[PDB]
Design a protein around this ligand. Structure first.
Ligand SMILES: O=C(O)[C@@H]1C[C@@H](O)CN1
Lengths: 342, 347
């Protein structure tokens, strides 16, 4: 007897970026803290197997994340979650935090109050406050208060064959970013350059992670440069972003965590102060509002408290049988990218 | 008006790794007096494109897989009808998707499952496809299709190319039209490491071949154009190795039923198979079909073959989609990063 054990997922997107939210049938993930759960997912073969089942073919596709809803361990939190992608499990994500909030409210798992509901999400990076503007059972907007974000290294350099010396910032916005001014590559962040930006982003991610090891100073489970995010500024002042994601695709959203990491660099450079906000646009022109709420410190260095505002849209529901002659999960380089061959 | 539109229910199935979602609920009326007319409508009317894009482009759809639209049978001999939706167009035929549809109908109980065997007669725009399903303990373990009459359009065509010199290929029909290309001419083999190169080559050739020749089924005006370029080879053990390339740029994970059907028509024309023969075919990922030649017939007064294609389907989930009045991306979209360079032209 099959279809005895089903996982139920709500299909949601935030400004174009898919965040499936697994709400029922999520297995127990070992670990005493959510950070330990993240570590286990990224180091235990059973966690890899679980992630691959959910995110590789035939159940998964190159675009989108699977958010595992997990029990809150912190009494202040309404729920916990970890983000699954084809590269690894990740601690944090703006677009996916909005998807989870949207899903929790629109499914009735959390009481929806109008005109505003506060949802406290627990991540491996810390608590993320999600303030939802609600109307008629609809979650219209969500503003996240992201985890304390900081600069790791400003103005780093790396030599490359195609562009010569590339300057970039290494910064933390819930995961670690290499932040790269795109004009250095002689490219603009526009749909026609998506393939070229992916190839550049992957080259850079691979090289940077070979040269330097980064870890959160208080949270050992968060390590490595997750993504290279290309950045520019539009004529009207908006921050244009293109987060590249292994094994080779771009974030459809303006990227919450990448904007948080970038905000830490803007503050370090004297270009923003608390109370400031601005727009960020993705490669497809979708938009977030990015705010600087205030300052804090992380392990002795200056840090920022970012806010990220965007909208989630529920577009369906999936039931996946957990209990096939392929089965495990597979990829091919045709749509997953050259790097997928690994 | 109403907040919610296009509420549809789909079974998630794959055949030897190739995804074929099957729409079993909320399917709207598709105009047309015949299934071929429905296919024409899907490929010509703005509302047909809207529906297809809704179902197959982001966020609801992804580069891999088809959506099979189950439709009311119009032929009284058929149990169900369907049309295949992909990011390039709607298509008349597909072996892997016929097996998905058969599997989904039986395993869901929408058609009563008989054991050890159930016969499901499927109507497509190309004609009736007999699906014989071996069924055991509530599961559809394998399906053998009797494909539509398949034939050669042109043998030994050639085309000049920058990278490969003169490429020899056959144009043939196996439910849709193929350009069939011996892969060794590219200096490549069909293996996962070459997937991206095969896609690029297949896309280049599809584009060039279609601007140079117009092909239409002689009895069915709605079936036109070269749908796919399928690279082919022969494994040491005699199996036919295939890699069907699909616009805007990916490979079939299955050995390809329609492509093997087209190829079978060329094998018969070259005197290399006779009725009763069968052989394996393998895809780029090593999944397998059994290909048989049942018999001979004619199309347009010229020789044609009746292929059989045997493979397995696997149901692995179910889902629902809807269209929220509030959603600004309800139309569907693509980006070249994972859909392919050619995706830039999808308006
Ligand atoms: O088996 C076949 O005929 C099909 C052709 C494409 O629909 C994908 N596989």
């Amino acid at each position: 007897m099959r279809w005895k054990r089903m996982m139920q997922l709500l299909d949601v997107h935030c400004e174009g970026e898919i965040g499936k939210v697994a709400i029922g049938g999520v297995p127990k993930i070992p670990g005493d803290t959510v950070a330990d759960q993240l570590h286990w997912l990224n180091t235990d073969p059973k966690g890899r197997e679980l992630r691959h089942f959910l995110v590789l073919e035939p159940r998964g596709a190159p675009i989108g994340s699977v958010n595992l809803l997990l029990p809150a361990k912190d009494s202040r939190a309404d729920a916990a979650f970890i983000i699954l992608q084809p590269d690894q499990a990740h601690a944090s994500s703006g677009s996916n935090s909005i998807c989870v909030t949207t899903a929790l409210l629109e499914s009735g798992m959390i009481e929806m109050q109008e005109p505003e509901t506060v949802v406290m999400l627990e991540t491996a990076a810390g608590l993320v406050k999600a303030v939802a503007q609600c109307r008629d059972g609809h979650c219209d907007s969500v503003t996240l208060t992201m985890v304390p974000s900081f600069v790791h290294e400003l103005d780093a350099q790396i030599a490359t064959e195609s562009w010569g010396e590339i300057r970039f910032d290494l910064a933390y916005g819930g995961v670690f970013y290499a932040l790269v001014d795109v004009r250095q590559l002689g490219l603009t962040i526009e749909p026609g350059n998506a393939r070229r930006l992916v190839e550049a982003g992957m080259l850079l991610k691979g090289e940077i992670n070979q040269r330097i090891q980064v870890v959160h100073p208080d949270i050992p489970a968060i390590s490595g440069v997750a993504y290279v995010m290309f950045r520019d500024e539009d004529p009207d002042g908006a921050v244009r972003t293109c987060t590249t994601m292994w094994p080779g695709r771009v974030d459809r959203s303006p990227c919450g965590t990448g904007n948080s990491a970038n905000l830490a660099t803007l503050h370090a450079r004297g270009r923003v102060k608390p109370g400031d906000s601005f727009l960020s646009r993705s490669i497809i022109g979708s938009q977030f509002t990015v705010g600087l709420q205030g300052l804090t410190t992380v392990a002795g260095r200056s840090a920022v408290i970012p806010t990220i505002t965007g909208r989630g849209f529920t577009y369906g529901i999936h039931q996946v049988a957990l209990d096939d002659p392929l089965g495990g999960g597979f990829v091919l380089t045709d749509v997953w990218g050259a790097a997928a061959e690994t």
